[PDB]
């Protein structure tokens, strides 16, 4: 018995086991485009994924993760509001049961069908485990997905989902290029936040891209065929694995554009 997205263990219940859920810098948040402040000090994002090495895709019960080799600076994120080098460790998605919901962050209260999270950790802290204990330990790149035309670079992920339908299943997933998931523009908003799943640590510097990337209804449909449960257990479709927007409180959202 643990946390999930059901009516008995959903986000509204998380605070009982993880008190930080009611913290001062929780994520996600609603991005108000008119209150967001343009900051000329912000440098362009530097995404170096040319040497990225994917290893495995895994169903972790609350979503599926596509893991990368982070033993060296193969795939890194620099620039933007960041100071230092952050290594890509995984990426995953959150999606809904309907096309009108699924994203965690919202833009002027607008919800997207899904949201992609590329997680990177600050190399100065050695390893992911130590990084999550620091205020500038992680740097998550968030990308919105809207339903429209299909995304060629996502199909490879879509095709292997059948092999990791239930919790605990994993499959080799090599030579996947994450560059195929990026929109044309790298304009972004940024704010200090947390991990949107337990244990909800406030160690994150969020970089949410303004431009969404389109996926077809067929591609999103296959996401909805995954199961929260493990094999041999009652089937529960993996849908609506998103946390609602949290209070912004004493925080300012900055934009790299105007
Ligand atoms: Zn996420």
Swiss-Prot record:
| Phenotype upon changing residue 65 to Q | 2-fold decrease in enzyme efficiency, as determined by kcat/KM ratio, and efficiently inhibited by chlorzolamide
Q: What is the effect of changing residue 5 to H?
A: Reduced proton transfer rate
Q: Effect of altering residue 197 to S?
A: Enhanced p-nitrophenyl acetate esterase activity, but normal CO(2) hydrase activity
Where it mainly occurs, coarsely classed, is cytoplasm
- Regulation of protein activity: Activated by X-ray, histamine, L-adrenaline, L- and D-phenylalanine, L- and D-histidine, L-His-OMe and beta-Ala-His (carnosine).
Q: Where is this site: Involved in the binding of some activators, including histamine and L-histidine?
A: 90
What CDD domains would the database entry show?
A: alpha_CA_I_II_III_XIII
* Chain's role: Catalyzes the reversible hydration of carbon dioxide. Can also hydrate cyanamide to urea. Stimulates the chloride-bicarbonate exchange activity of SLC26A6. Essential for bone resorption and osteoclast differentiation. Involved in the regulation of fluid secretion into the anterior chamber of the eye. Contributes to intracellular pH regulation in the duodenal upper villous epithelium during proton-coupled peptide absorption.
Protein name as annotated = Carbonic anhydrase 2
Designated gene of the protein? CA2
């Amino acid at each position: 018995h643990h946390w999930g997205y059901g009516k008995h263990n959903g986000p509204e219940h998380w605070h009982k086991d993880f008190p930080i859920a009611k913290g001062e810098r929780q994520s996600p948040v609603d991005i108000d485009t008119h209150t967001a402040k343009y900051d000329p000090s912000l440098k362009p994002l530097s995404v170096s994924y040319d040497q990225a090495t994917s290893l495995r895709i895994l169903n972790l019960g609350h979503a599926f993760n596509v893991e990368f080799d982070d033993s060296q600076d193969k795939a890194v994120l620099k620039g933007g509001p960041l100071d230092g080098t952050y290594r890509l460790i995984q990426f995953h998605f959150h999606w809904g049961s309907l096309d009108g919901q699924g994203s965690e962050h919202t833009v002027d209260k607008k919800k997207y069908a899904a949201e992609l999270h590329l997680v990177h950790w600050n190399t100065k802290y050695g390893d992911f485990g130590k990084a999550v204990q620091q205020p500038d330990g992680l740097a998550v790149l968030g990308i919105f997905l809207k339903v429209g035309s299909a995304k060629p670079g996502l199909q490879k992920v879509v095709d292997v989902l059948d092999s990791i339908k239930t919790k605990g299943k994993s499959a080799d997933f090599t030579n996947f290029d994450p560059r195929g998931l990026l929109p044309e523009s790298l304009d972004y908003w940024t704010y200090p936040g947390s991990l949107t799943t337990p244990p909800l640590l406030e160690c994150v510097t969020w970089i949410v891209l303004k431009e969404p990337i389109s996926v077809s209804s067929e591609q999103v449909l296959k996401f909805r065929k995954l199961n929260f449960n493990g094999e041999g257990e009652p089937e529960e479709l993996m849908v609506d694995n998103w946390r609602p927007a949290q209070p912004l409180k004493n925080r300012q959202i900055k934009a790299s554009f105007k």
